[PDB]
Design a protein around this ligand. Structure first.
Ligand SMILES: OC[C@H]1O[C@H](O[C@H]2[C@H](O)[C@@H](O)[C@@H](O[C@H]3[C@H](O)[C@@H](O)[C@@H](O)O[C@@H]3CO)O[C@@H]2CO)[C@H](O)[C@@H](O)[C@@H]1O
Ligand SMILES: [Cl-]
Ligand SMILES: [Cl-]
Length: 372
């Protein structure tokens, strides 16, 4: 039997359907008292919401895979048991297991495959228009945010650089302090004068008002964008961009969304938390998340269900996940520093605060900063 009390943290608009998932959980485990709330600052900030006070945080919490190495090294999350590991590995696609594995051990329960795509109004742009960045932006406005390094760091990967080495595990393996890195910096700078590129902190609102024809966004907004655009909804994988005069695919990050178990829980409550984490990331639960938000399951069987297989967003995400189209977010303990330093590097190139004469120096300093 499983008993205990657990607090579950999810993102704000997910609460209603996680209550449904928890109702399903309680059909099987009637003696576990679950309290579902939003987290203080979201899954993108689990690192710091938990780290502020691990013992006060939720017992099960949503967290993106890049945060896992830091949290594992800090002792905030424990390795999954052999049986829990086997279930994750057998039930989900390979990249989901890679996403949660740190130094050979799994530290979270994966449930969604995240890659950004182009979402666009098909009354304003065609499927062919969205194939290239310059062609798209010559025909309509793309609204985006150069202060968000998750949007634009992957241009460095398109340029041929590595982030923490071949598989994201090498402390000194970021080699963006190179001519290839400078090509990406130059691309950011070029976008400031591209009249088809609108800087905004709320790209979704610009799409909704009609001031943008396209945005880059991820599947956490799939159902939201389908509702906004209605019959004008369309989606595509990322386009090509020109780097050093060559057309190359513009990458996104590939992220794996997970739930992790807070290592503070003990006794019954710990067993209840692990049971909940497993359940809310199971196939049925992944499909409920899909039904409500449009996020893409990592479960092998769910990905091949007729409804997922026929969803154009799922198809675009599957394309994005292929080699060359995205890179799995690394999970090095340094990642919080990486993100903090990457955003002003990129935005400085975009705004001109970093001029071309300083690209090499700034990239050298960046690599030193993130490689400790
Ligand atoms: O920008 C730095 C930031 O990048 C990464 O965060 C991204 C998440 O991985 C990704 O899931 C997405 O987050 C959204 C949630 O999924 C959604 O439920 C809701 O909370 O909105 C979030 C977006 O605001 O996008 C973010 C990037 O914006 C990385 O995981 C972070 O650790 C890193 O700090
Ligand atoms: Cl381009
Ligand atoms: Cl406890």
């Amino acid at each position: 039997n499983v008993s205990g009390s657990v607090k579950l943290w999810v993102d704000t608009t997910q609460v209603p359907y996680y209550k449904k998932i928890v109702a399903n959980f309680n059909k099987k485990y009637p003696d576990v008292k679950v309290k579902v709330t939003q987290s203080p600052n979201g899954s993108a900030n689990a690192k710091t919401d938990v780290g502020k006070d691990p013992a006060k945080a939720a017992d099960v919490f949503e967290v993106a895979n890049d945060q896992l190495g830091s949290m594992a090294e800090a002792g905030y999350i424990n390795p999954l048991s052999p049986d829990a590991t086997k279930a994750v590995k057998n039930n989900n696609v390979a990249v989901a297991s890679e996403g949660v594995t740190w130094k050979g051990k799994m530290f979270a329960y994966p449930f969604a495959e995240q890659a950004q795509t182009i979402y666009y109004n098909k009354s304003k742009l065609t499927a062919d228009d969205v194939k290239t960045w310059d062609g798209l932006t010559a025909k309509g406005v793309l609204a985006t945010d150069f202060t968000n390094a998750y949007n634009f760091y992957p241009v460095f990967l398109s340029a041929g650089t590595q982030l923490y080495g071949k598989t994201g595990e090498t402390v000194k393996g970021t080699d963006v302090n190179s001519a290839k890195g400078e090509q990406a910096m130059a691309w950011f700078a070029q976008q400031k004068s591209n009249k088809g590129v609108m800087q905004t902190s709320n790209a979704l609102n610009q799409l909704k008002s009609g001031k943008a024809a396209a945005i880059l966004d991820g599947p956490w907004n799939s159902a939201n964008i389908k509702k906004i655009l209605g019959k004008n909804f369309a989606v595509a994988p990322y386009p090509t961009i020109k780097l050093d005069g060559k057309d190359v695919q513009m990458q996104a990050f590939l992220g794996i969304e997970t739930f992790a178990v807070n290592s503070h829980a003990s006794g019954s409550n710990q067993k209840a938390a692990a049971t909940l984490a497993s359940f809310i990331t199971n196939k049925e639960s992944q499909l409920i998340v899909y039904d409500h938000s449009g996020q893409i399951p990592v479960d092998k069987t769910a990905q091949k269900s007729s409804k997922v297989a026929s969803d154009p967003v799922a198809g675009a995400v599957m394309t994005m996940a292929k080699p060359g189209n995205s890179t799995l977010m690394p999970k090095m303990p340094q990642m919080a520093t990486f993100w903090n330093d990457a955003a002003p590097l990129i935005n400085g190139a975009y705004t001109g605060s970093i001029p071309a004469s300083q690209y090499s120096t700034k990239l050298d300093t960046f690599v030193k900063n993130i490689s400790k």
